[PDB]
Amino acid sequence: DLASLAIYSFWIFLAGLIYYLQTENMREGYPLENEDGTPAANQGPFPLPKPKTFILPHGRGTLTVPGPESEDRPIALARTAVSEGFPHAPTGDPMKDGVGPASWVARRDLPELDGHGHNKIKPMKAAAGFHVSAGKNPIGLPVRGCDLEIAGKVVDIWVDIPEQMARFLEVELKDGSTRLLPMQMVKVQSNRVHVNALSSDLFAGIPTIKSPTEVTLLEEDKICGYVAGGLMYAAPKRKS
Amino acid sequence: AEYQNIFSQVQVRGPADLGMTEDVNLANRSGVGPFSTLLGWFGNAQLGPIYLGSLGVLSLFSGLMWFFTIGIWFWYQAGWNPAVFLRDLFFFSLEPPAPEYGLSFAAPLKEGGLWLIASFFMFVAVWSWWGRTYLRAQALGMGKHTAWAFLSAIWLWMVLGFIRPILMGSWSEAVPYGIFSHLDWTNNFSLVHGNLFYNPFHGLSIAFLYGSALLFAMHGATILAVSRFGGERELEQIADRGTAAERAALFWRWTMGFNATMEGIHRWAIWMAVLVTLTGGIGILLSGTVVDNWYVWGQNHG
Amino acid sequence: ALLSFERKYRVPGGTLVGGNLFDFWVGPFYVGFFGVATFFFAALGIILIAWSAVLQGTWNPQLISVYPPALEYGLGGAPLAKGGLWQIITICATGAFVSWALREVEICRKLGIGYHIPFAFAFAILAYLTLVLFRPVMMGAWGYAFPYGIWTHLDWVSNTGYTYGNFHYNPAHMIAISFFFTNALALALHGALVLSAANPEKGKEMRTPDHEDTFFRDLVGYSIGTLGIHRLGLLLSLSAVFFSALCMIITGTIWFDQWVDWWQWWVKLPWWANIPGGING
Ligand code: BCL
Ligand code: BCL
Ligand code: BCL
Ligand SMILES: CC[C@H]1c2cc3[nH]c4c(c3C)C(=O)[C@H](C(=O)OC)c4c3nc(cc4[nH]c(cc(n2)[C@@H]1C)c(C(C)=O)c4C)[C@@H](C)[C@@H]3CCC(=O)OC/C=C(\C)CCC[C@H](C)CCC[C@H](C)CCCC(C)C
Ligand SMILES: CC[C@H]1c2cc3[nH]c4c(c3C)C(=O)[C@H](C(=O)OC)c4c3nc(cc4[nH]c(cc(n2)[C@@H]1C)c(C(C)=O)c4C)[C@@H](C)[C@@H]3CCC(=O)OC/C=C(\C)CCC[C@H](C)CCC[C@H](C)CCCC(C)C
Ligand SMILES: COC(C)(C)C/C=C/C(C)=C/C=C/C(C)=C/C=C/C(C)=C/C=C\C=C(C)\C=C\C=C(/C)CC/C=C(\C)CCC=C(C)C
Ligand SMILES: COC1=C(OC)C(=O)C(C/C=C(/C)CCC=C(C)C)=C(C)C1=O
Ligand SMILES: CCCCCCCCCCCC[N+](C)(C)[O-]
Ligand SMILES: CCCCCCCCCCCC[N+](C)(C)[O-]
Ligand SMILES: CCCCCCCCCCCC[N+](C)(C)[O-]
Ligand SMILES: CCCCCCCCCCCC[N+](C)(C)[O-]
Ligand SMILES: CCCCCCCCCCCC[N+](C)(C)[O-]
Ligand SMILES: [Fe+3]
Question: Which residues cross the membrane (chain A)?
């Protein structure tokens, strides 16, 4: 029967597809590792695929995956148990150390570029002729932390030019310096911007950017990681 | 409360984005359309520009001709009364030739001939549209994944309207053009073939359709969950993995014991979706050509 | 047992119940209190299914079927062998699904991500609950629920649909289907777009999000954007399920006849109801 041959053939195809798909999905993060960083004995039934090479635009180089894997940063954590499968506790300030939910990845220390090779993200003052087109303009608003104290004021919006979206708020602290607050992590209200993830005392601790007019991928990761980290690590003073 | 990133809080706008050039013939591109603040709460506010060109003109003309061929038949069926047109809109139907006419193009105009004409226009509309998905990617130096995925949908469409009727030996097997009548046709198709629930390819098709909703809900929810780390910038996460991609991965690893990458999830996505119409088309194609009755076939396993 | 980048994420905290008691992994799997809850509810349900299989007299996976109580029980308890097993398995299933969601919540907290995933999953749970709980309760009997069997659940779909003629004519069902089909369309397009930019023509540089916008604007005159497409996927798939639930909850509670007849309200609007001609005159 032809329908029998068809359905049998399909299941064989499907198992092959799943094999292809799972190995495609092992180009990052493998080989698996014991908790001390050594290659794990059991790698599962799927082998790593043959490497592929991405040619990055704007002379940024190439990426070959799979390839040799390393964090390229120190991790301030320690085993809580001799056997595998248990948590690793922060040995310092997890927020300052960038671990757990405050983690960040050693991304390129250059800014993402658009299709034409210009910085993707710019402060609105430097983005011609971008403006707030709808909703409450947050520039000028005081920024409140989860302790209900003012930590600063919004002085600009950092915009994704090719996607025409607000990505960060630039917030000026008491000392006159600024920090980027991720747009996904702030509540714009009519009289304030509220930030649930961080108490007022934690804004100074937000990682800073090297140049005032651009942000690198590494910087974004450090900033986003740090702010998200506050939901777990600032929970003491909130209470709101 | 926390912000959920379903709707934007603040819209920003700049100069209209006229897009990448590459090998695109810029003369065939329109100007920008208007900006929709309403759309801007959810996705991009900008409309247009669109690429025209010769293939697109052909496609659009053809499509409109298909649509108007049906519509004129509806007007006829309504006796040119506009109130009757609106009342019975979903009840009108442009039907294929009766079985006695077989595959012949000599079916009378009002008994299948017009259906053939409408079908010819749809045929060229869709296939020229497919060429366009290919060419638009080509002019931009992009892969042809869109054209390949589109082929899976075209497969089911072709089977329903073209391949199966030809193998069955009459146009009468094809689907009529009507809102309610295409539904009646679907119901009847299952009834006549011994219940499509016994067609293993219909079952597969459903697994993948449900699976598509499962997977897009998963992927969509995941990306939004890590958008606080710029997770939706998927191409750059592919080129240079960030904590977004890592947390996305580990959510799933910890939940269900395995995970994707930022690139590979999009391979799961495209296959999950294309398998809907691939298995579907096969299921429909075997029905009546090889298997008269799926209940019966199931009792034999073959 | 760990991905190369995983260690820095495996910290204490985030649990909802029990503090650090269940705060650990088994291989890749996170446990948590609700990991344990899932195991209990799941293992119980499965043991009860196997018991039902014994009472049915079969181990064939294609034959095992657990039925709700007959209609005469209404919304009351039933003998184990005559619907009670179904009732307890349903409780186990619910406990397991809800536990899975809550475990996802714990995982979100540890990773410091949004709660979007378990929120989405809850729509699936609510649809299941529509079919086995909300609807049967509104209709006044557990027996209006679907049975737990691979083929018998399909008989129930077929019997339930045909109780109302062609179930295609259910207007909420139509909208649900549209969402399902559009969702698959958008999943295919999203997968393809990203891939076509990440894997360009041979020897070319990766394309950028700008090229993804351009391709789609060139093709259809619009691009929803990278944030937009993931919101859309989520909206489409959740709306599909929402309207699925809706289409069933109204069936046998506020609508009783052949669904085809519902459309007559439009046809019989007085200003055109009696005009000769067309299909309905
Ligand atoms: C949704 C509306 C209807 C429905 C009508 C349909 C129709 C019509 C069909 C199915 C089909 C499927 N249905 Mg159903 N079915 C429903 C209720 C459900 C429920 C539930 C609510 O708990 C479950 C578990 C299932 C699961 C099943 C699968 C056996 C099969 C493929 C599903 C799939 O790939 O989905 C997508 C999800 C995935 C791809 C993820 C994988 C999950 C699957 C594989 C899990 C199956 C579990 C099953 C074997 C039970 C195991 C329980 C154990 C005791 C623990 N259905 C309700 C009543 N279902 C198809 C079939 O072939 O049936 C024979 C089919 O044609
Ligand atoms: C009483 C009804 C029967 C029924 C008989 C049918 C029949 C008949 C068929 C299906 C098919 C399918 N059935 Mg069934 N089915 C049953 C009940 C079920 C149930 C359930 C009980 O819950 C479910 C979930 C399903 C669901 C499914 C899908 C998995 C599948 C269609 C996939 C698809 O994406 O098509 C939608 C996609 C397309 C049709 C492709 C579209 C192609 C493009 C090229 C068209 C371009 C349009 C353009 C010109 C117009 C543009 C206008 C705009 C303005 C731009 N069936 C019962 C038993 N079913 C199909 C299948 O594959 O079965 C194997 C099919 O032929
Ligand atoms: C002859 C049959 C009738 C008809 C009968 C009815 C009936 C009756 C129903 C539908 C419903 C459905 N029909 Mg219909 N319908 C038919 C024609 C079709 C056609 C078609 C192409 O003709 C299509 C596309 C559809 C599609 C639709 C969908 C809108 C809907 C199913 C999805 C859903 O509810 O998700 C919801 C998702 C779930 C219920 C799954 C939830 C499961 C979760 C919580 C967890 C389970 C996981 C666990 C067990 C897995 C084990 C773990 C493993 C390790 C994996 N029908 C014909 C006309 N239709 C159903 C509906 O709307 O339901 C609400 C329904 O009851
Ligand atoms: C993998 C399977 C899923 C899938 C995939 C899929 N569909 C796709 C694609 C792929 C990847 C394409 O790339 C292609 C596309 O370009 O999408 C944007 C497409 C497509 N799938 C479409 C629809 C569609 N797909 C279907 C579904 C599915 N598609 C499956 C679920 C269905 C269902 C479920 O029934 C529908 C109806 C189209 C939007 C598009 C194909 C476009 C096309 O061939 O157009 C030809 C016709 C015209 C050019 C015009 C038609 C005329 C209109 C009827 C009325 C007039 C309106 C007009 C547009 C305005 C013009 C007026 C001006 C003069 C002012
Ligand atoms: C709302 C949008 C769509 C959706 C979303 C969704 N599903 C999800 C999630 C989300 C985002 C996940 O977070 C979660 C997941 O972890 O996926 C990998 C999940 C999930 N959706 C799943 C399945 C599923 N989803 C469905 C569909 C959908 N899910 C919707 C279309 C379907 C369909 C359509 O039939 C199925 C079969 C699982 C893969 C997973 C939930 C896993 C889980 O709850 O595990 C805990 C419980 C067990 C391990 C087993 C419990 C055993 C019971 C006690 C006994 C069996 C009783 C059962 C009622 C018998 C049914 C018999 C059938 C033959 C009818
Ligand atoms: C207001 O009034 C006007 C007139 C101005 C506008 C109104 C228009 C209206 C009301 C039109 C409405 C259109 C409708 C309701 C269309 C519905 C279409 C549906 C529901 C389609 C469903 C399935 C269609 C399929 C499967 C068609 C398949 C077609 C093919 C595969 C083509 C096969 C090719 C053939 C037979 C021709 C062979 C010839 C060559 C040369 C190969
Ligand atoms: C590949 O990803 C996709 C986008 O491109 C990046 C889109 O843009 C859209 C189209 C979105 C909408 C809402 C169309 C309606 C537009 C108007 C003018 C009202 C789809 C489906 C898509 O899948
Ligand atoms: C629905 C498709 C089936 C998906 C399940 C199979 C893939 C899981 C196997 C991945 C194993 C994880 N591992 C060991 C590689 O890390
Ligand atoms: C499937 C997505 C369909 C999107 C609808 C098409 C919008 C057309 C916008 C083009 C208008 C540009 N303009 C005004 C210069 O013609
Ligand atoms: C892309 C991977 C998705 C895997 C989904 C596989 C689900 C299998 C559904 C069983 C269908 C059984 N039957 C008889 C209809 O063929
Ligand atoms: C079609 C349903 C199949 C269900 C099987 C479950 C797939 C999950 C596989 C996870 C891999 C477990 N592993 C290898 C890491 O131990
Ligand atoms: C309530 C339904 C009974 C549960 C059956 C257990 C699932 C087994 C998977 C069904 C496929 C049968 N198989 C693998 C032999 O082909
Ligand atoms: Fe994506």
Answer: 2-21
Q: Which residues pair with B207 in a beta bridge?
A: none
Do A111 and A210 lie in a common domain? yes
Which of A160, C195, A131, C47 minimizes the C-alpha distance to B268?
C195
CA distance A99 to C8: 5
Tokens of A56: 């990055």
- For residues A206 and A169, state if they share a domain: yes
What domains are there in chain B, each with its CATH number? 1-143 (1.20.85.10), 144-302 (1.20.85.10)
Copy the structure tokens of residue B15: 């100069």
| Determination approach | X-ray
Distance CA A160, CA A117 (A): 13
Q: C191 and B269 in contact (C-beta within 8 Å)?
A: yes
Pocket test for ligand 12, best of C150, C151, C155, C156 (most atoms within 8 A of CB): C150
Nearest partner of B103 among B60, B162, B62, judged by Cα: B162
Question: What range does the domain containing A51 cover?
Answer: 2-106
The beta-carbon neighbor of B10 closest among A22, A128, A188 is A188
Q: Is B145 annotated as a binding residue?
A: no
Residue ranges of B 230-259 with Cβ closer than 8 A to chain A: 230, 233, 236, 238-247, 249, 258-259
Experimental structure resolution, Å: 2.3
What residues contact C193, with CB distance under 8 A and at least 6 apart?
Answer: B145, B146, C212, C215, C216, C229
| Domain termination site, one of A106, A123, A143 | A106
CA of B87 to the centre of ligand 13 (A): 43
Measure in Å the smallest separation between the Cα of A176 and chain B Cα atoms.
25
Q: Which ligand is nearest to the CA of C61?
A: 12
For residue C244, give the ligand nearest its CA: 3
Q: How far is CA C60 from CA A28, C57, C86, C122, in A?
A: 41, 9, 18, 31
CATH of the domain at A111: 3.90.50.10
Taken in order of first residue, the domains within chain C and their CATH numbers are 1-163 (1.20.85.10), 164-263 (1.20.85.10)
Nearest to B152 by CA among B260, B64, B40, B280: B280
* Nearest by Cα to C87 from C145, C40, C138: C145
Q: Say if A141 is an interface residue toward chain B (CB within 8 Å).
A: no
**Do A46 and A79 share a domain, yes or no?**
yes
Q: Among B164, B176, B170, which residue's Cα sits nearest to residue B102? A: B170
**3-state secondary structure (DSSP) of residue A157:** strand
Domain count across chain A: 2
* A126 and A207 fall within a common domain: yes
Distance of alpha carbon C109 from its chain centroid, rounded? 24
* Distance from the alpha carbon of residue C71 to the mean position of ligand 2, in angstroms: 34
Q: Residue C226 and residue A163: Cβ atoms within 8 Å?
A: yes
For residues A111 and A86, membership in a common domain is answered with no
Residues A184 and A152 in one domain: yes
User: Which H or E run includes B146?
Assistant: helix B145-158
Residues 6 or more apart whose CB falls under 8 angstroms from that of A125 comprise A156
CA-to-CA distance for B180 and B96, rounded, in angstroms?
Answer: 15
3-state secondary structure of B149: helix
Q: Judge if A222 and A136 occupy the same domain.
A: yes
C111 at the A interface (CB within 8 A)?
yes
Mutate to test the pocket of ligand 9, among C190, C220, C229, C232 (most ligand atoms within 8 A of CB): C220
Strand, helix or coil for residue B277: helix
Q: Does A177 touch chain B (CB under 8 A)?
A: no
The answer to the question of whether B252 is labelled as a binding residue is yes
Distance from CA of B235 to the nearest CA of C (A): 6
- Nearest-atom number in ligand 5 for the CA of C146 is 65
Establish whether residue B33 lines the binding site of ligand 9, counting it when its CB lies within 6 angstroms of any ligand atom. Answer: yes
